[PDB]
């Protein structure tokens, strides 16, 4: 800081002194300008008016030239001088960044001290190439049952989560990131702790400020950052937000280090890409959207990369979210989004009514990297459930019609309920993978079947309860070695008799 | 309707045939023992 | 302390934003005044455009007003619409530096008012103890949770 | 670029090629003048119940009454061929502001009131010097926002150098706003 | 307790900072000065705990 | 400054200025014209022409007429004294009762606060409904929807809301009209000034006194220009800003049909050039209206509950209108015409309906254990509907038509006969707390009430009535 | 070499002002004060010696007047056994990080078709070791083979397995496209030819390589590129194939995939250049578009190449211009079903949607077509009896119906396999069924002597004698 008399006072007079490319602005309207002048401006840079508001030249037609505007048209009077920076649109990187929250542009508005970075990096780039990338190995734990089970995540993927309106999307995503405050408070190798990047397009503020405080709740700010174009924030900072995520993300993915990415609301970055183009007079295409869609969804997914040995070894994980109409998927953006990702997770309101939450359609669901993002231990036990599941969506419809079946379905019928039953949920309550193993085999090795459904939903907690209190080791050793040997079998199957003894349901 | 439909039929058929699988595996070994493996 | 010193250096930045903001507005005004009253500027600004073709009353008057501001201490001020620009300004000053100490101290009144009709009443050598006190023992607790949860 | 622009662009061109320059260039200004003083020529320019031959024949009247080259005369029987009599003022504007430009620009200025011979001078003198253009023919106008400080536009475009007092002090203001 | 001793001790703030950011310097010396003497008495305590 | 009109289009008006030009947003009067003629400042356009929306009927303008720039937006007033008033988008009253003495007056265009300057703490209404105080809890100081079509009973659903919350409030309110009927206007400014919400007194010199009021009023009708309804919801947000910023106090902000916000936008984007969007809709479909829900929102100083009635076109959810305005709201309730046709009323779609504050970490747990069983219940009903329809109910077993039985008994008793409709209902009207409806649908669904008719819960309220119902259709 | 001026930009379309010597269309522009290379390709004339051309790179950091060269030439790419063992881009560059293309030869991607005095030859049988497709829809030896799908359908492992049971024992050359897909698919594809021996890189001491052998050239224009290069690219590996055909003689195998981002990509700059849109957003130049580049793709008199193409069909619907346009353009054909992967049947090939010119009685004999048309006609039989029994059951169908259903079923879970490259998804091996073997387990099933099986022995196996096997096994672990 500093004083008025002395110091301010000689500053603004030493700041007064002048006299005698530059171009003035010929029309304005809708947040976006057209200037006459300024032949040498790169398409894409940063232009500044002579009332601090800024711009990015995007049209860079024979006459005139078209900018538009990170903010209200209000200031810009068709006549005001403008100048160009020089410098392409870019946004800082670095560590200074986590606990904060800013808009795309990476000016803060947490409203508490400015942002310590001094490296730069430019917005849009090109995506790293085929020779410097590897293939996925490691598992990117999302805390939930089901995930980490049957969809299992990777370090590297682009993975969609695609559902309707009010089915649990920002959830999966903010336990994603509350899953992983014990993995990194537990180590201080950056190479095995995960930041988080969390991009809200078109959002409300009071929606970020909900989530900003579900995190600052539970202590997961310190490694993760927010990034905020919300819809009062003009179109043109709706289609850099996510840029500059990938931007932020990339130093993660650079030096060495790992990161996570969630696009919130990627339809409301296409909505802006088309606003733009239509107030810049391009044509449209079907839906009024333009062509360029695929182009604008492609650039960003595909810089999510797993590099190699030789360029650090790290990783840009994306989890980009899209809500469809009337669960048609057969739209225009789902199926652009969808032919670009490795991977789904489809959310359906039937689902999240009937009582299944998170309402994850373990059908339509995938993920094409699969096994190689998935540990021994939950391969063992994941596959046998999307087996048994398999079985029970197979059969359970014409079961329910009140048919006399035998024993051999009664069982599949039974296994399934017990399952699906388990893949149950709260929200912001996630698990630890050892604990997700050892609540798997017991409802996969026969521990459920007799038991109540209704039953299971304590079953489960106490068992954790259990697990956490006396049998640690179990949990320790089978978060180090990442397998079930015989012994760590055996003494699983002795807790869970031990548990059963001691405790007592309706059957 | 469709996946009604579609649900129920393929649980018809999957219960049906499962029953003639068993008792096709049963009535097997005893009319074609040159497969049992037990007797090779 | 360190939700305290964020507060502190928001207010002392608003504090700053607003006096620039006062400092240039009043010298702006003032400017719009004696340019419409004056003669001589006007061939003082003829003449200077002239010799811009090939210094103005404007950046004069400014820079003659923000060195006479450099070294005012504008604690020693007046009242607010007392015409010379320091006057103007240093009003603002010090009611914001009031407003702003007003909300990080404790006053002098507060202060005054329990130190001479609460607490030496009590006793004297060491204030040993509390019984010997009327209810308002309870505002007093009350000012506790005010001064340490302002401080 | 603009369509007024092609035609100026080739009428300076062949001007500086075959003819002359000057005889176009004061048929320019006369054209012009006719047009903003007559004020009955720019609604038989704008009006379309005059035919095309009755265009051209008071166009040819206008050749032979006055002083007229011919490119001038094919300039206009072509603006009626693709019909952009319209254009004329327009193209007149253009072909002065570039440009009109190997012999002497005109330019805009303003002021408050009545300025003096002295400053006038002074005025013309430097903007000469500035300019490096031996011939200058200038306009005078009162707009009263910039207070008295001369503002003008020497005209090409590129430069309008605002020699004022209110905008340099807003411009000053808006810049010491700044943050610290 | 597991929650006070997790994150050991990131908190430990740096005066330098906050005497160069701040122009009163005469509220914060005090405040420091309450600071310095209450962590003695509270690192007194545990060590005689 | 003075400019001249040089093309008119409609609700669009070209004006060209000599010297210098407006800012965008500014207001301009016309001055060769019979009323007040206000335009507002869109777009430049070169040539120093700028392009303006008029806020009244464009008849009798003249290529030629001369316009008067103000220098700065449109200026609502504010104050007590808007309080127990009607005002149009410009502030002029049209209550016939004099001119508004209020001391300062707020700009029609403002920024919205920013993000640190939010507090989203979780709260309820007591709206007396059953269907939202059990599965679509309201929230104080948050956003409020009612999607719904044509004829559903959105005006019938606020009338009820104004009855059993603004006059059980303490604080002030607001309500808008966004191109809704003259009639029901009138309607809601005498019905405030029966029940005491508006509360004005003649004196003896023709003046008036509105000294008392709780209510503020702003109408901009379906007989009005695209201009002077794109204008007017802001107009009362400035109204409310007042209160919640300088007053400090919590506000009510009821909204009919901000929609024709958007549809004012659909019949004035053509005459303003711009290409339209996949419905015919806009390319600022989306900002023009987060520009206009930011401002809505609890802060550090005041609070604004909100509640908006959001029109669907030709009864389709998959609109741009709905689809983009259904990110902005805290709490939801999607009206339905299937079922309005069974005579059920309110018509709300328990599952299309939802809400943020219905997790247990608000609302107990027993109450949201009910809540989902209800849920789980009619959608396992809903999942039966064709195989109801082709085949018929004798073919499903026992537990699905105890299913069938349990959903049409929670159907027919999540209706209740409001007070408002009583002039063409007959039956009086039924508040009903949350305790009641919560014991009544737990023993529901537990089975307590499964030897009662399906009649007996239709427009009943609490669970005595129906059986009282039941014992008099037992005879 | 003349000179040029950008005069506008707009997304990946360039206009550009020449003072004489206009160049002709489709010639390649480059642009000079750039960071990296940046190529156009000339697409109209507009007048006043004006043209509007397409950036292979991204156009950001552009500028009005920037100076640009013609080359006199369409877009060259480097042609001879150097590409070999070799990945290339659409202009011709290498992105393998291995060092320069040393090519003592370069073809023109834009060439003119084979006309029609230039015959196919006949139509040669082609053994890929799959069963439905060796039996329903026989795959050509010398024609374009198609693979329609959707998305999680299996047209890049269906590819890799083609890959692996035809390339690596082809004699002659290969060349893969990926035109707008996955980049970790192109690392995989390229760890597994390095793995396989289809690549063979040897480094040297003094920092060269060795391709030799290598029996096998990748060209990539994928996802992060812009257009203009994904429609170029496919052109780029079509001309390298070219030259193996024509000069060297020799027969030659084309792996493309998602060949509709060609498509795609010309949709996203039509309407920039001006064009109208077509009925559901397409450009209208899309027949032409793409007959000009299938008719470059056949069987002549100096060569032969085996083409087989991926082509993505958009929510399942097989009625969009690109497809519908595409289907006639193809020898063979394979439709790969969701309702069919739903049931864990991969490959998931529906036998009522593939087609094939080459079964006949007369190419294929009356043993292989009877075969096919009685597995096709008992499929439909079993297709035409799902609503009656959803609605009434099993219970009504005679035994006859009950026989056919059941043979139906066989029939499905047998021609089922599992691949080499899905060890990653099923952990099972893979297999290679011949086509005999598939003739004759088809006969034995449609004759009847199988009935005594059960039909879960069929799933996974490769003949009759694993399907006794499995039976053999679930009926000792029965007991």
């Known amino acids: 800081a500093k004083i008025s008399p002395s110091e301010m006072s000689r500053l603004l007079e030493e700041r007064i002194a002048g006299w005698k490319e530059v171009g003035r602005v010929v029309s304005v309207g809708d947040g976006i300008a057209r200037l006459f002048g300024l032949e040498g401006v790169q398409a894409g840079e940063l232009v500044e008016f002579q009332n601090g508001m800024t711009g990015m030249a995007l049209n860079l037609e024979t006459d005139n030239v078209g900018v538009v505007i990170f903010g209200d048209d209000r200031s810009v009077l068709e006549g005001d001088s403008v100048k160009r920076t020089g410098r392409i649109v870019d946004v800082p990187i670095g560590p200074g960044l986590l606990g904060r929250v800013v808009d795309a542009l990476g000016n803060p508005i947490d409203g508490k001290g400015p942002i310590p970075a001094k490296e730069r990096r430019r917005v849009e780039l090109k995506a790293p190439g085929i020779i410097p990338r590897k293939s996925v190995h490691e598992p990117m734990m999302t805390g939930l049952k089901c995930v980490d089970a049957l969809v299992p995540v990777g370090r590297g993927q682009r993975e969609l989560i695609i559902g309707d309106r009010q089915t649990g999307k920002t959830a999966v995503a903010v336990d994603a990131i509350i899953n992983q405050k014990e993995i990194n408070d537990s180590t201080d190798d950056e190479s095995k702790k995960l930041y988080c990047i969390y991009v809200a397009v078109g959002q409300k503020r009071s929606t970020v400020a909900q989530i900003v405080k579900a995190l600052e709740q539970r202590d997961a700010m310190k490694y993760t950052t927010v990034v905020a174009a919300t819809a009062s924030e003009a179109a043109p900072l709706q289609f850099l937000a996510p840029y500059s995520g990938c931007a932020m993300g990339e130093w993660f993915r650079d030096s060495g280090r790992h990161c996570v990415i969630i696009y919130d609301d990627l339809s409301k970055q296409a909505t802006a890409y088309r606003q733009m183009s239509l107030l810049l007079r391009r044509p449209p295409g079907r839906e009024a959207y333009p062509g360029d869609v695929f182009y604008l969804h492609s650039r960003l997914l595909e810089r999510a990369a797993k590099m190699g040995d030789k360029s650090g070894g790290g990783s840009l994980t994306a989890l980009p979210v899209i809500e469809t109409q009337a669960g048609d998927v057969s739209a225009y953006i789902p199926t652009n989004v969808i032919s670009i990702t490795d991977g789904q997770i489809f959310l359906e309101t039937e689902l999240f009514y009937k009582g299944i939450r998170p309402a994850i359609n373990v059908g339509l669901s995938v993920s094409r990297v699969g096994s190689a993002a998935q540990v021994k231990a939950m391969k063992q036990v994941a596959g046998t459930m999307k087996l048994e599941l398999a079985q029970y969506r197979e059969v359970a419809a014409f079961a329910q019609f009140g048919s006399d079946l035998d024993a051999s379905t009664r069982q599949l019928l039974t296994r399934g309920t017990a399952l699906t039953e388990l893949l149950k949920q709260r929200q912001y309550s996630p698990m630890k993978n050892s604990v997700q193993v050892c609540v798997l085999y017991c409802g996969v090795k026969g521990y459920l079947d007799p038991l109540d459904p209704k039953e299971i939903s304590r079953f489960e907690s106490l068992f954790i309860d259990y697990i956490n209190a006396n049998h640690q080791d179990i949990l320790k050793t089978i978060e180090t070695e990442k397998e079930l040997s015989e012994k760590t079998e055996a003494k699983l199957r002795a807790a869970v008799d031990e548990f059963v003894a001691m405790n007592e349901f309706k059957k | 309707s469709v996946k009604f439909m579609d649900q129920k039929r393929s649980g018809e058929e999957t219960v049906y045939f499962k029953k003639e699988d068993e008792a096709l595996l049963r009535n097997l070994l005893a009319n074609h023992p040159e497969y049992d493996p037990k007797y090779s | 302390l360190v939700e305290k010193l964020n507060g502190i250096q928001q207010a002392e930045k608003l504090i700053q934003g607003s006096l620039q903001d006062v400092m240039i507005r009043e010298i702006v005004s003032s400017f719009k005044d004696l340019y419409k009253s004056r003669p001589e500027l006007h061939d003082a600004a003829m003449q200077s455009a002239i010799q811009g073709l090939s210094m103005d009353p404007v950046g004069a008057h400014f820079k003659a007003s923000l060195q006479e501001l450099a070294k005012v201490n504008l604690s020693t001020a007046t009242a607010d619409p007392m015409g010379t620009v320091v006057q103007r300004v240093a009003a603002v000053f010090q009611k914001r530096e009031k407003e702003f100490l007003d909300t990080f101290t404790v006053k002098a009144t507060e202060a005054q008012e329990i130190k001479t009709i609460v607490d030496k009443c009590h006793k004297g050598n060491t204030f040993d103890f509390h019984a010997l006190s009327d209810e308002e023992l309870r505002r007093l607790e009350q000012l506790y949770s005010t001064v340490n949860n302002r401080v | 670029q603009t369509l007024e622009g092609r035609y100026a662009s080739a009428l300076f061109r062949v001007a500086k090629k075959k003819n002359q320059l000057e005889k176009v260039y004061g048929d320019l200004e006369s054209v012009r003048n006719a047009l903003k003083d007559s004020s009955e020529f720019r609604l038989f320019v704008d009006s379309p119940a005059v035919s095309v031959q009755q265009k051209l024949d008071v166009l040819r009247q206008l050749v032979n009454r006055y002083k007229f080259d011919p490119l001038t005369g094919n300039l206009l029987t072509t603006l009626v061929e693709n019909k952009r009599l319209p254009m004329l003022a327009r193209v007149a504007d253009a072909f002065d502001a570039m440009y009109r430009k190997e012999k002497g620009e005109v330019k805009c200025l303003v002021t408050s009131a009545k300025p003096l011979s002295a400053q006038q001078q002074k005025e013309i003198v430097a903007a000469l010097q500035n300019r490096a253009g031996t011939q200058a023919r200038l306009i005078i106008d009162y707009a009263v926002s910039p207070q008295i400080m001369g503002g003008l536009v020497v005209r090409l475009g590129e430069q309008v150098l605002d020699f004022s007092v209110a905008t340099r002090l807003d411009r000053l203001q808006s810049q010491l706003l700044a943050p610290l | 307790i597991e929650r006070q001793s997790t994150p050991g001790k990131p908190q430990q703030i740096d005066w330098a900072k906050w005497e160069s950011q701040i122009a009163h310097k005469d509220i914060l010396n005090c405040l420091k000065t309450f600071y310095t003497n209450q962590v003695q008495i509270l690192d007194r305590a545990l060590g005689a705990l | ?475």
Do not use: W
């Not at chain 6, 009510?252 to 711009?274: H, K, M, P």
């Not at chain 6, 399906?454 to 059986?467: K, N, P, T, W």
């Open chain 6, 1 to 475: 400054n003075h400019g001249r009109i040089t093309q008119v289009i409609g609700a669009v008006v070209d004006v060209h200025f000599d010297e210098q030009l407006p800012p965008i947003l500014n207001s301009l009067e016309v001055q060769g014209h019979t009323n007040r003629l206000v335009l507002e400042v869109a777009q430049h356009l070169g040539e120093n022409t700028v392009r303006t929306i008029a806020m009244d009927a464009t008849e009798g303008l003249v290529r030629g007429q001369k316009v008067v720039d103000t220098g700065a937006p449109i200026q609502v007033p504010v104050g007590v004294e808007t309080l127990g008033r009607i005002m149009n988008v410009i502030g002029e009253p049209v209550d016939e009762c004099g001119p508004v003495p209020a001391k300062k007056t707020y700009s029609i265009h403002r920024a919205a606060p920013l993000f640190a300057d939010q507090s989203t703490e979780p709260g309820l209404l007591q709206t007396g409904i059953k269907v939202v105080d059990l599965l679509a809890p309201y929230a104080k100081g948050g956003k409020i929807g009612l999607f719904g079509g044509a004829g559903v009973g959105k005006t019938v659903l606020i009338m009820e809301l104004i009855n059993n919350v603004a006059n059980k409030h303490g604080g002030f309110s607001v309500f808008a009209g966004v191109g809704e009927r003259t009639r029901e206007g009138n309607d809601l400014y005498h019905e405030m000034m029966t029940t005491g919400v508006i509360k004005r007194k003649k004196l003896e010199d023709g003046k008036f006194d509105f000294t008392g009021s709780k209510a503020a009023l702003v109408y901009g009708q379906m007989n009005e220009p695209p201009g002077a309804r794109a204008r007017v919801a802001l107009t009362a947000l400035s109204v409310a800003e007042y209160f919640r910023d300088e007053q400090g106090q919590d506000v009510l902000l009821f909204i009919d049909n901000i929609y024709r916000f958007t549809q004012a936008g659909s019949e004035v984007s053509a005459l303003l050039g711009r290409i339209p969007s996949a419905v015919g809709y806009q390319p600022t479909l989306a900002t023009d209206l987060g520009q206009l829900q930011e401002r809505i929102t609890t802060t550090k100083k005041g609070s604004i509950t909100s509640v908006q009635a959001v029109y669907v076109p030709a009864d389709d959810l998959t609109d741009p209108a709905p689809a983009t305005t259904f990110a902005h709201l805290d709490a939801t309730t999607v009206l339905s015409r299937q079922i309005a046709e069974l005579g059920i009323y309110p018509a709300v779609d328990p599952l299309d309906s939802t809400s943020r504050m219905l997790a247990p970490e608000i609302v107990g747990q027993e109450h949201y254990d009910t809540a989902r069983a209800t849920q789980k219940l009619l959608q396992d009903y809903k999942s039966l509907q064709d195989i109801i329809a082709i085949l018929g109910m004798d073919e499903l077993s026992e537990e699905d038509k105890l299913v069938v039985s349990r959903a049409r008994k929670i159907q027919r008793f999540l209706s209740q006969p409001f007070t408002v409709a009583e002039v063409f209902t007959g039956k009086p009207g039924r508040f009903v707390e949350l305790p009641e409806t919560i014991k009544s649908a737990q023993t529901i669904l537990r089975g307590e009430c499964d030897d009662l008719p399906e009649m007996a819960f239709y427009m009943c309220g609490g669970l005595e009535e129906v059986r009282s119902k039941a014992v008099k259709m037992a005879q």
